[PDB]
Amino acid sequence: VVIGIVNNTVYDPLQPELDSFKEELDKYFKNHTSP
Amino acid sequence: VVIGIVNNTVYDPLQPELDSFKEELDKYFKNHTSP
Amino acid sequence: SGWTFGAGPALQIPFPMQMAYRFNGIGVTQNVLYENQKLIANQFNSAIG
Numbered sequence: 001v002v003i004g005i006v007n008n009t010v011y012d013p014l015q016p017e018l019d020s021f022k023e024e025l026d027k028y029f030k031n032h033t034s035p
Numbered sequence: 036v037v038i039g040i041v042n043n044t045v046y047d048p049l050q051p052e053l054d055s056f057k058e059e060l061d062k063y064f065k066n067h068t069s070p
Numbered sequence: 071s072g073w074t075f076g077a078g079p080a081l082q083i084p085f086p087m088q089m090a091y092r093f094n095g096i097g098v099t100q101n102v103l104y105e106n107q108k109l110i111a112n113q114f115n116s117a118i119g
């Protein structure tokens with residue numbers, strides 16, 4: 001509905017804030033399923 | 036560059052809010068890997 | 071004191087923290103002052119001269 005809006009990406013800081021643990025969570029799950 | 040800045044700790048609320056859950060996540064994984 | 075001496079008992083506050091509290095009224099955030107502190111001081115001095 002707005003005129004002049006421009007495509008882009010919004011860097012949602014809370015997503016990397018939780019990803020700081022989510023990455024090592026994926027690492028822990030890799031260790032969990034490895035053996 | 037700033038004169039008079041005093042050392043201390045900043046209690047970033049988002050971390051203990053996560054850490055309130057990050058403390059219980061790691062403990063749960065180790066129990067399931069035990070068998 | 072600042073603006074408080076004209077609205078109540080006259081409370082005290084250091085001058086480098088009574089100008090970081092007046093940029094905020096303009097719109098520019100306060101940090102700018104400390105990051106330019108010394109430079110700004112010189113400019114102000116030259117100004118009065």
Ligand SMILES: *[C@@H]1O[C@H](CO)[C@@H](O)[C@H](O)[C@H]1NC(C)=O
Binds near residue numbers: 005006007
């Ligand atoms: C913006 O992106 C969407 C999907 O990515 C697309 O459908 C739309 O045409 C794009 N608009 C402009 C102005 O680029």
Ligand SMILES: *[C@@H]1O[C@H](CO)[C@@H](O)[C@H](O)[C@H]1NC(C)=O
Binds near residue numbers: 039
């Ligand atoms: C405050 O001023 C006194 C004397 O004017 C000086 O000795 C002291 O170092 C100053 N405080 C700071 C943090 O510079």
Ligand SMILES: *[C@@H]1O[C@H](CO)[C@@H](O)[C@H](O)[C@H]1NC(C)=O
Binds near residue numbers: 040041042
């Ligand atoms: C603040 O802590 C850091 C690291 O512990 C130290 O290098 C610095 O000298 C300290 N500054 C003050 C003003 O205590």
